[PDB]
Amino acid sequence: RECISIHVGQAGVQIGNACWELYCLEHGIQPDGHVPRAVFVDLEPTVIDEVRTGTYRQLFHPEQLITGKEDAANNYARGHYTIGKEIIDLVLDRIRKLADQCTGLQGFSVFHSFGGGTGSGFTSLLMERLSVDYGKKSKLEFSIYPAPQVSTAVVEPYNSILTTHTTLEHSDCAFMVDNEAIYDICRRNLDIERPTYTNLNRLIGQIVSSITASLRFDGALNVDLTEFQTNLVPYPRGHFPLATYAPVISAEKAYHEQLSVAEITNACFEPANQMVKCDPRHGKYMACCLLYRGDVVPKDVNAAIATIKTKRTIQFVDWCPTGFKVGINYEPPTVVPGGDLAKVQRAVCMLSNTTAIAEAWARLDHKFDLMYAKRAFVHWYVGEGMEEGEFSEAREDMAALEKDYEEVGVDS
Amino acid sequence: ITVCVRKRPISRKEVNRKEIDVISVPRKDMLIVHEPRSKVDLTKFLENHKFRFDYAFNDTCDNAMVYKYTAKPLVKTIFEGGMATCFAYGQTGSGKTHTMGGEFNGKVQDCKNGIYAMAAKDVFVTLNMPRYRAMNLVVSASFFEIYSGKVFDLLSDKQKLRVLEDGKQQVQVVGLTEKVVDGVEEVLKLIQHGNAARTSGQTSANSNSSRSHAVFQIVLRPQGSTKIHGKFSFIDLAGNEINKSLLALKECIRALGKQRVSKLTQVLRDSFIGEKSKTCMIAMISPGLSSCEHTLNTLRYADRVKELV
Amino acid sequence: REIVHIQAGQCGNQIGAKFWEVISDEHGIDPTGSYHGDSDLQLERINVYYNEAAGNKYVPRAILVDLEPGTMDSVRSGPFGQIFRPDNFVFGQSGAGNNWAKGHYTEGAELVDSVLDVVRKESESCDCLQGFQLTHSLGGGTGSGMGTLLISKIREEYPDRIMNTFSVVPSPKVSDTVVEPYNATLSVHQLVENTDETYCIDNEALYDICFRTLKLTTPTYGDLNHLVSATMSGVTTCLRFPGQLNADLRKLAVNMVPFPRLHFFMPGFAPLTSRGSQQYRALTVPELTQQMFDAKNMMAACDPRHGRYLTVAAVFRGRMSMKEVDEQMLNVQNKNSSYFVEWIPNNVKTAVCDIPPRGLKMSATFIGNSTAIQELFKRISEQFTAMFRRKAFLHWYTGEGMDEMEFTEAESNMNDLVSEYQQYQD
């Protein structure tokens, strides 16, 4: 029934504090109410401390807040092997101590930031140690994969080609939200050149609320977590769909809010609104899980979608007749009291697997080579319990992820 | 240019592991790789690939047999006044050290058993023959290794050597020590000495290691000549800086047919440039299924080299 | 992050005084004083060049290598000269002969160990090391020879940390020495194979740029040096400041070197206007790119207009629009598609700090990797042969324990280096 969550890496923790905020906010549980149902991991104390100093301070147990005073290191190796190792046990312990206390759970919603040290590496083995300790569950990892041109870390790819290959054979469904492609939404669909990280977080903090929160919440067309991976992954590769939200209108500027279904659903497939720089440049969808929430008439959907199924310029895979999982919830969304999110009475958090990422992975793989081609910051990992193996052998890994996402599509 | 491939038999460790033998050599010049593969649905199938070489040696073949087909035909070349090179190429544990240096799963043992020794044996015998005797040649040997762009004299306690190049672009390794040999026994002593001194990591539980490039050379000198009468360089390559050298090596050998520098190619350069120069490449293959990726890499590399033929 | 400057030879040393003269003020560090910094930002990143001991004494973490006392004893007996901890002075009272061979094999080779010693004391200082800055001239002993050794050793000790090299390649028109191409060809050789970022400056490319781009009529050395030091501040130190889009030695390295040679660049400063009058303020931005990308204004001798570019790095440092920056760069890339090489869709590497050069409103360091610098190593290489052929002043080298094959080596090497660079101009 439940779904634990492990927010790993400063980012996964910032986003965590955010997604965790939106929660109580739409459940009437102020600062000090019940008890969360997740954990927080980081090898840099000062960040988890922000959850220990700032807002939502006492809504957590100093037990579900793991820290390694030591060093973060923007390098996979160190975070996965060398350092990150020391903490893992302890980490697990909570996701085994928190996993027990419950009643027939469904899985762990993992929150990490692909291209980091504590986020890429660590998790790599966290999800790793999970796939074995609970192979019998769902492993949906919600990632924030590398901005297409606006990356931060100098190594980023090293850290992301490595978190992909190690987690690939362990996740159930990996959700993806592109940090940059979300900015566009903040520039083009909300207008603000002042987007603090605290915003992107409010956003995913939204799209995510549509996943677990409301879905695990009764409705006219419930959709379990398992449901996802089933209706969402055509193949064992921990396939990565993309998150998209519909009413991303500004709560100040424009106001047409009352945008009946027929509209908000069409607003999902236009590439300028998908929290991912993977513009459907060719990527044929192969399965979409349209999660609606608020006042929505099933016919409105079983029509708004029909209209789409016949737009053709939206070309769905061949081997897939119908790939539209319609998830209907009741309670409308719940916008921050005064952030910058419109606040409509219905939304569409549609996520999907698109042959599109054939790109995004490509463009991120290429990156890697360029540097590896010169070993660039390699000495930083080797000296951290890794080898020419793990790199070269994780490169070959993704290679067959560029062929995979190619074969499962583009062909009939 | 001659290119051959030699498959080593599965070792006891692999056998105990129950590793599957992926390679077959049905003919003298045909090598087949039974690549295991799975479709997306994970259907199992075999993609059998075929490779042809001047000579393909089975797991049964001894070093003497291998030597007969590869290096042996080169010895005359040096007496002819040419420059010959024989390279052992392949993945780690493929058998390169065993073949060149002597029989050992550790790659280190009986010098007499290996190509360096066998080649030397033939050198003394030929020198003695009537056509050659008039030559009044002296035989010298050297052994050195190349590690991370550095050259070390195995004959002179790993002494680091400096390599210079003239405008003329001829290269010289200054300080390299040449030792006079007048008997195979002599050469065996030098091989033993050099091999002991060879580079590596900590004492591994088993086997040697190929962090470096090993090069044992046999030189013939009257009083210079073409800077010596003839020279044979036997090279024990590192498991396939290393990449650059291998890429460099390929281009130099192919250049040999017609006529991104590395240390190895720099030192060896005189051996590629001359008109009267021959080379042989022996590709070593480990038969285990686990090594299939490595083998195809080795084989493809080999194909391009022979292509120059 | 961090770095440890290296003042090899007199020149490299003389310049040290100017590079530190500047940098300090660009970090509010008085002679022995502390941080008087007009602001509070010129301190959160200083570490890159200093060390904490007293609490008002942040000492420059550089090395002063030289076989001629008088020199360092002029730098240590003048202005900021009393800020370097004496431990930094690695002198060689020997005869600092003007021979590359005398400061690389015979005389310098001794003083080396007593240097590496310190270069380790400074490296193992604290936090994480990035790389080392190296100043010197390729036309003398303590410069090309001994300094070119200092690196060959450094690059064996930390083939991880970077190595920027600021070389004063032998100016054309007139050579301030005679064997020049000897001391030079021999040092470039060592460079193309150890440091991985070299910024070549020409005493006469400066004069020009200093006598016509600064109506300056009496350009003393101090000046030239001063101008140079202005660029090396924009490079390093600068990027160790915040920015909408900041980079750091590596970015600079990992965006500027397509092929491992190491390649040499040619630095160019932005606002280079004469004092009073000229103070036109035409610095909106198109004015800076106007500047930086012209022929004259390239501290190098050669002219870009004489050969494509492989990479370019406009490291700006002053509040500007990531739009009027990112934009300009483009037109520039299209008005001159001719020379800018094609197999690199976006040669330019736009970098953008925030805080500008203390007293200025907007500046932008230029680090160009153009194929034009082919026409310089050519020069050098020529001078060699024309004199090598007759072994001119060769006895001063050999007689110092050298080799007739050593000179051959270098020329060729550095000579081939010319070759390659053309492989892209085409």
Swiss-Prot record, chain A:
It is found in: Cytoplasm, Cytoskeleton. The modification 3'-nitrotyrosine is found at Y255. GO terms for biological process: cellular response to interleukin-4; microtubule cytoskeleton organization; mitotic cell cycle. GO terms for cellular component: cilium; cytoplasm; cytoplasmic microtubule; cytosol; microtubule; microtubule cytoskeleton. Its EC number is 3.6.5.-. One of its GO terms (molecular function) is double-stranded RNA binding. Mg(2+) binds at E44. Keywords: Acetylation, Cytoplasm, Cytoskeleton, GTP-binding, Hydrolase, Isopeptide bond, Magnesium, Metal-binding, Methylation, Microtubule, Nitration, Nucleotide-binding, Phosphoprotein, Ubl conjugation. Tubulin is the major constituent of microtubules, a cylinder consisting of laterally associated linear protofilaments composed of alpha- and beta-tubulin heterodimers. Microtubules grow by the addition of GTP-tubulin dimers to the microtubule end, where a stabilizing cap forms. Below the cap, tubulin dimers are in GDP-bound state, owing to GTPase activity of alpha-tubulin. Belongs to the tubulin family. This is Tubulin alpha-1B chain.
From Swiss-Prot, chain B:
The gene is Klp10A. Disruption phenotype: Marked perturbation of mitotic spindle architecture. RNAi-knockdown in the male germline abolishes the asymmetric enrichment of Alms1a to the mother centrosome. Residues 1-308 form the Kinesin motor domain. Interacts with Alms1a (via C-terminus). Expressed in male germline stem cells and spermatogonia (at protein level). Disulfide bonds: none annotated. ATP binds at G90, Q91, T92, G93, S94, G95, K96, T97. Belongs to the TRAFAC class myosin-kinesin ATPase superfamily. Kinesin family. MCAK/KIF2 subfamily. Required during anaphase to drive sister chromatid separation to promote flux by actively depolymerizing kinetochore microtubules at their pole-associated minus ends, thereby moving chromatids through a 'poleward flux'. Involved in asymmetric cell division of sensory organ precursor (SOP) cells by playing a role in the asymmetric localization of Sara-expressing endosomes to the pIIa daughter cell but not to the pIIb cell. Klp98A targets Sara-expressing endosomes to the central spindle which is symmetrically arranged in early cell division. It is found in: Cytoplasm, Cytoskeleton, Microtubule organizing center, Centrosome; Cytoplasm, Cytoskeleton, Spindle pole; Chromosome, Centromere. It comes from Drosophila melanogaster (Fruit fly). This is Kinesin-like protein Klp10A.
From Swiss-Prot, chain C:
Some glutamate residues at the C-terminus are polyglycylated, resulting in polyglycine chains on the gamma-carboxyl group. Glycylation is mainly limited to tubulin incorporated into axonemes (cilia and flagella) whereas glutamylation is prevalent in neuronal cells, centrioles, axonemes, and the mitotic spindle. Both modifications can coexist on the same protein on adjacent residues, and lowering polyglycylation levels increases polyglutamylation, and reciprocally. The precise function of polyglycylation is still unclear. Keywords: Acetylation, Cytoplasm, Cytoskeleton, GTP-binding, Isopeptide bond, Magnesium, Metal-binding, Methylation, Microtubule, Neurogenesis, Nucleotide-binding, Phosphoprotein, Ubl conjugation. Its cofactor is Mg(2+). Mg(2+) binds at E68. The modification Phosphothreonine is found at A54, T284, T289. It is found in: Cytoplasm, Cytoskeleton. Tubulin is the major constituent of microtubules, a cylinder consisting of laterally associated linear protofilaments composed of alpha- and beta-tubulin heterodimers. Microtubules grow by the addition of GTP-tubulin dimers to the microtubule end, where a stabilizing cap forms. Below the cap, tubulin dimers are in GDP-bound state, owing to GTPase activity of alpha-tubulin. Implicated in neuronal migration. This is Tubulin beta-2B chain. It comes from Bos taurus (Bovine). The gene is TUBB2B.
